[PDB]
Structures are given as structure tokens and as C-alpha cells.
């Protein structure tokens, strides 16, 4: 606790939900209070990435109203948040970046907002909820442009394509992965290897082909999908529990980070072979982020309240 600069809250809630490197090199943190008296959440910026989660050695901090289920950077000073409250909120960073201010908070979902993703242009975003709806936002306008009840169960993960502002992948507990493209009169299209596999629980587009992606299931399997082929290219049993997240490295031939409720991290190559594995966490592993400055550095956070920096061969 060197200063805990103005407007930052005294304490940081135990359950770390998200961690995102800015191109700048700084670290964004999301945190929920998921037990005890107050069920809230908070936002943090750590210009010293090695100094997290320590509250006093932070650049800025702010109490959110409810817990944070998901988040993402908007450009460079914007922070977009998926709330328990059923709200999507946008917080915009200070000009000096020592203060974090509400910009809009829109209560548009009927239940917890659980997933949020920023579209390629950076002007629009798509969110997913337990209310089973998927919504498309004008971030500049602060409005819902489109609403979609495509799914039959709560939405687990939405993800914008790297380059196309109208294509995004979503997956739900109704056992569907949907390829979207708002340009069509009927936006969604059901992509998968075939008939019922295990439930899809996580998604990541390839950062190099708007054509290829990986999905993770509740059974611990990560699979590789080609939309161009519609058949299941390659898969592997990487985990002993649910796969909660998939993150590609910035490398030219990129690596795949893979987090799970078995409290482990895995790094996989092109063909989904195990290169690295970490037990550093002793509770669930919630997010992974690759250093923009050092591409062999990787940071992960869990519900054990550890912020952990990995060196990857």
C-alpha cells in the first residue's frame, strides 16, 4: 500500500475474474466479491504489472456496483463491463489515468450479463446473458441497436471476429455454437462437427485467419474448427474439468493458452500439443493475458487471488 491513489477503494475483492494487457504494457483487472456480506465488484489499473494484486501499488481503482462477470478494453482508455446487475457498463479512464469514471450504465438484460466482446472497428460491442438474449451495442450512442433470442439456454461466451465488424461467434448451454453475420436476413448459422457433443464453454478466433477458431467444452476438451470446412479438424483432451478460456499468443505462429476449473494452465501449439502446464493456482483459473512487451511472458489470475506471471518456452 504505497499510496492507493484518489478514488481507489481500500480493499480488493478476493475473486479475480479478468486480466487484460493494454498494448501500452499496463494491466487491467476485474474483481468480484462472490461471498461474504457485500456482493460487489471492482476495477483496477496496474502500470506496474509485477506489483498486482497489491492495492497500494496501483495506478487507479474503482468500486463497481455489482460483481464483474466479464470485461474487455475499449481502445486504450475504455473499459467495458458485464455486470451481475444485468447491466452492461462502460468506464472510461482518467486523462492522467489516476481516476476511473462511469460513462454509461445500461440495464438492458433481464438477468446477469455473463459475456462481453468488442467488435473489430471498436465502435460496437456484443454481449451475452443468462436471460438467453444476445445484444449489439452502439458504444458511441450508448444504445442497444439489435437484440437476438437465438439460443434456448443461457449464453456462455460471445466473441467478435478479429477483422469483420458483423461476424461474431457465440455459444450457449443449449448446445449450440453460432456463427453470426448481421449482414444476413437470418444472422445466425449453427456450426459444429455434427450432432450433440459436450456443451461448449469457451471460444477464441484465430488471430491470423478470420476463417479458423478453437472451442472448449465442459468435459475439458479443446477443439479446432474450420468454418470453411464445417468438419471437426483436430481436438484434444487438455483438461480434467470445464475449459473456461482460450487465449492466443501474439506470436506469428501463435500459441494457445487454456484455462480451467481444474485450476491449471496449459499452453498448446499449432496442432494442440502440450508445451507447458502450471499448477500455480489453488482455486479456479479465470483469465489469461500475454505480455505485449515480452511475448514469452503470460499472466493469469484465479479465485485464489493470485496474479501470476509465467515464462513460456
Amino acid at each position: 500500500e504505497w499510496n492507493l491513489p484518489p478514488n481507489a477503494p481500500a480493499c480488493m475483492e478476493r475473486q479475480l475474474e479478468a486480466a487484460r494487457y493494454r498494448s501500452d504494457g499496463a494491466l487491467l483487472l476485474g474483481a468480484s466479491s462472490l461471498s461474504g456480506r457485500c456482493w460487489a465488484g471492482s476495477l483496477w489499473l496496474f502500470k506496474d504489472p509485477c506489483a498486482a494484486p497489491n492495492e497500494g501499488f496501483c495506478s487507479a481503482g474503482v468500486q463497481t456496483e455489482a460483481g464483474v462477470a466479464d470485461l474487455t478494453w475499449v481502445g486504450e482508455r475504455g473499459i467495458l463491463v458485464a455486470s451481475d446487475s444485468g447491466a452492461v457498463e462502460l468506464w472510461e479512464l482518467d486523462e492522467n489515468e489516476t481516476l476511473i469514471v462511469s460513462k454509461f450504465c445500461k440495464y438492458e438484460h433481464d438477468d446477469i450479463v455473463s459475456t462481453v466482446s468488442v467488435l473489430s472497428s471498436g465502435t460496437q460491442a456484443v454481449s451475452g446473458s443468462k436471460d438467453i438474449c444476445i445484444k449489439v451495442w452502439d458504444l458511441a450512442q450508448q444504445v442497444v441497436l439489435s437484440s437476438y433470442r437465438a439460443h434456448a439456454a443461457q449464453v456462455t461466451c460471445v466473441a467478435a471476429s478479429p477483422h469483420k465488424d458483423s461476424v461474431f461467434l457465440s455459444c450457449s448451454e443449449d448446445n449450440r455454437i453460432l456463427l453470426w453475420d448481421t449482414r444476413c436476413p437470418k444472422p445466425a448459422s449453427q456450426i459444429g462437427c455434427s450432432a450433440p457433443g459436450y456443451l461448449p464453454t469457451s471460444l477464441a478466433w484465430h488471430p491470423q485467419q478470420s476463417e479458423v477458431f478453437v472451442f472448449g467444452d465442459e468435459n475439458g476438451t479443446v477443439s479446432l474448427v474450420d468454418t470453411k470446412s464445417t468438419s471437426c479438424v483436430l481436438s484434444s483432451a487438455v483438461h480434467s474439468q470445464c475449459v473456461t478460456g482460450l487465449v492466443f499468443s501474439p506470436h506469428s505462429v501463435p500459441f494457445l493458452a487454456s484455462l480451467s476449473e481444474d485450476c491449471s494452465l496449459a499452453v498448446l501449439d499449432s496442432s494442440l500439443s502440450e508445451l507447458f502446464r502450471s499448477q500455480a493456482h489453488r482455486d479456479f483459473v479465470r483469465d489469461a493475458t500475454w505480455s505485449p512487451l515480452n511475448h514469452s511472458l503470460l499472466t493469469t489470475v484465479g479465485w485464489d487471488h493470485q496474479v501470476v506471471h509465467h515464462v513460456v518456452p
Binding site: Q15, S32, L34, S35, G36, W39, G67, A69, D84, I112, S240, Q241, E261, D262, C263, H281, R282, D283, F284, W303
Partner: peptide
């Protein structure tokens, strides 16, 4: 209990998550 607070009952270490639940 918190709607998002998934708990584990068999496999270590999550099984042993410090409380309160």
C-alpha cells in the same frame, strides 16, 4: 449463495477453498 460462485466438492485444490461459503 452467489449465482456465479461455482463450488467444488471432490477434487483438490478447489475442494479446499477457504470460506465463508
Amino acid at each position: 449463495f452467489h449465482p456465479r460462485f461455482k463450488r467444488e466438492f471432490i477434487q483438490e485444490p478447489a475442494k479446499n477453498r477457504p470460506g465463508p461459503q
